């Protein structure tokens, strides 16, 4: 079988805190 | 290499060590020689963390 993720597999690219900031 | 003791320089064996300092994204690691410590706040200061 195969299935569809929707919005899955997002990890914090590294340390360094951060707040409201649509960071790219 | 067939090394032999009667070889002109530039054909004698040299031993090499390559140190490579890397900085991933951890919290810290090895360094030079520590010194002092303390911790001042509420004052313009010159700091090293």
From Swiss-Prot, chain A:
Top-rank taxon: Viruses
Subunit structure: Binds to host ACE2. RBD also interacts with the N-linked glycan on 'Asn-90' of ACE2. Cleavage of S generates a polybasic C-terminal sequence on S1 that binds to host Neuropilin-1 (NRP1) and Neuropilin-2 (NRP2) receptors. Interacts with host integrin alpha-5/beta-1 (ITGA5:ITGB1) and with ACE2 in complex with integrin alpha-5/beta-1 (ITGA5:ITGB1). May interact via cytoplasmic c-terminus with M protein. May interact (via N-terminus) with host bilirubin and biliverdin, thereby preventing antibody binding to the SARS-CoV-2 spike NTD via an allosteric mechanism.
Function recorded in the entry: Attaches the virion to the cell membrane by interacting with host receptor, initiating the infection. The major receptor is host ACE2. When S2/S2' has been cleaved, binding to the receptor triggers direct fusion at the cell membrane. When S2/S2' has not been cleaved, binding to the receptor results in internalization of the virus by endocytosis using host TFRC and GRM2 and leading to fusion of the virion membrane with the host endosomal membrane. Alternatively, may use NRP1/NRP2 and integrin as entry receptors.
Protein name (record): Spike protein S1
Source organism: Severe acute respiratory syndrome coronavirus 2 (2019-nCoV)
Part of the whole protein covered: 27 to 50 of 1273
From Swiss-Prot, chain B:
Subunit structure: Binds to host ACE2. RBD also interacts with the N-linked glycan on 'Asn-90' of ACE2. Cleavage of S generates a polybasic C-terminal sequence on S1 that binds to host Neuropilin-1 (NRP1) and Neuropilin-2 (NRP2) receptors. Interacts with host integrin alpha-5/beta-1 (ITGA5:ITGB1) and with ACE2 in complex with integrin alpha-5/beta-1 (ITGA5:ITGB1). May interact via cytoplasmic c-terminus with M protein. May interact (via N-terminus) with host bilirubin and biliverdin, thereby preventing antibody binding to the SARS-CoV-2 spike NTD via an allosteric mechanism.
Gene, per the UniProt record: S
Shown chain mapped onto the complete sequence: 495 to 543 of 1273
Name listed for the protein in its UniProt record: Spike protein S1
Protein source organism: Severe acute respiratory syndrome coronavirus 2
Residues covered by region (Disordered): 25-47
Known function: Attaches the virion to the cell membrane by interacting with host receptor, initiating the infection. The major receptor is host ACE2. When S2/S2' has been cleaved, binding to the receptor triggers direct fusion at the cell membrane. When S2/S2' has not been cleaved, binding to the receptor results in internalization of the virus by endocytosis using host TFRC and GRM2 and leading to fusion of the virion membrane with the host endosomal membrane. Alternatively, may use NRP1/NRP2 and integrin as entry receptors.
């Amino acid at each position: 079988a195969y299935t569809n993720s929707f919005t899955r597999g997002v990890y914090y690219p590294d340390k360094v805190f951060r707040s409201s900031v649509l960071h790219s | 290499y067939g090394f032999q003791p009667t070889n002109g320089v530039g054909y004698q064996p040299y031993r090499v060590v390559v140190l490579s300092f890397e900085l991933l994204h951890a919290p810290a690691t090895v360094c030079g020689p520590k010194k002092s410590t303390n911790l001042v706040k509420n004052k313009c200061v010159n700091f090293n963390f």
